[PDB]
């Protein structure tokens, strides 16, 4: 329940609408709303750990942008990264964003 | 910024209103705060005094009262007449008060 | 203290080195204390001298600060 490091996908607020009856299209009287309340639609975050310059870097990312983490690793080959902390390397990858 | 005074210690002035209308006297003191002047021998009040080292035996003393500055008009030391005041710029070029009847200096 | 004397204090003050200034303050600061003591026992009728010295010390230090700042 949080933010996509790559895409910025965030929790959003959506309504949960409750309906009774038969739609007009199927010969019915019509749909009546029997309830509306707020709820949240979370991004589908998963952990993505990749080794980069021999270091372990992990990403919190929406499943949709899971392959975008790898494209970063690929792009990260032209950078002199070795010796750095994972904190630093991750910042460097994210700068390729 | 500062109170406008058309009169100062101690040029000579005519009292043109009140109980001492027409008298002439020197400007003993100017009190810009109250916008009032003290004119010698004008507006004499009797004040009581307590028996003290200052005034043993005591009784009363005579004092000059302050006069509203508007009640007073400087006299021109040239032509000798009561006048309003103008200003004049010299070559210095300082400014001076001058008589409006003749071009007299008023200092 | 007199206007003309102020100007005169400043001219001669601006000719001192910082150390001379520092030394001069210390003495006038000492004289201030001497004044305060006599003020205490009611033996200073010329009390204006206190205000006067305070501003000398002020004017000195201002100049000491002048000397150092550019």
């Amino acid at each position: 329940s949080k933010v996509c490091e790559i895409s910025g996908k965030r929790p959003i607020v959506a309504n949960s609408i409750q309906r009774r009856g038969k739609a007009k299209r199927e010969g019915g009287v019509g749909k009546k709303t029997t309830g509306i309340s707020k709820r949240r639609q979370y991004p589908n975050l998963q952990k993505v750990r990749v080794r980069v310059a021999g270091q372990e870097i992990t990403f919190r990312v929406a499943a949709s942008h899971i392959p975008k983490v790898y494209e970063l690793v690929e792009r990260a080959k032209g950078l002199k990264l070795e010796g750095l902390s994972p904190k630093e390397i991750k910042k460097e990858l994210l700068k390729l964003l | 910024m500062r109170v406008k005074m058309h009169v100062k210690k101690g040029d000579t002035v005519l009292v043109a209103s009140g109980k001492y209308k027409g008298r002439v006297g020197k400007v003993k003191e100017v009190l810009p705060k109250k916008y009032a002047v003290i004119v010698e021998g004008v507006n004499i009040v009797k004040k009581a005094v307590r028996v003290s080292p200052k005034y043993p035996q005591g009784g009363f003393i005579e004092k000059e009262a302050p006069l509203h500055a508007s009640k007073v008009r400087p006299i021109c030391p040239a032509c000798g007449k009561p006048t309003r005041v103008r200003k004049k710029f010299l070559e210095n070029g300082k400014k001076i008060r001058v008589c409006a009847k003749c071009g007299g200096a008023l200092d | 203290m007199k206007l003309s004397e102020v100007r005169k204090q400043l001219e001669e003050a601006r000719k001192l080195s910082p150390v001379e200034l520092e030394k001069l303050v210390r003495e006038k600061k000492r004289e201030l204390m001497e004044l305060r003591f006599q003020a205490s026992i009611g033996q200073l009728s010329q009390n204006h001298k206190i205000r006067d010295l305070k501003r000398q010390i002020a004017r000195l230090l201002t100049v000491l600060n002048e000397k150092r700042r550019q």
Binding site: - | - | R26, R30, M33, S40, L64
Partner: protein, 95 residues
Amino acid sequence: MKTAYDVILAPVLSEKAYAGFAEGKYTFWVHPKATKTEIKNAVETAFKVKVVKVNTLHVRGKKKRLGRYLGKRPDRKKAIVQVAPGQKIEALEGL
């Protein structure tokens, strides 16, 4: 700039401060922020003495009023310095 004459304000003028002159304990009003050690050096370079013992205390400002207006006198601090055997601070011997 900080000097000794900034630290020592005035001497304490009271029946109790006088009593100490006999035994070389002098009592000054000092600046409330000034340290014992600081007060030592100060009286020493001020009066050419040798300070052996310093006792300090704070004195609360007495609360006073002018009719409508309640207020407070400034907070003070006094110090009692003990000069070396045989020494004297003549200025305070005054009296």
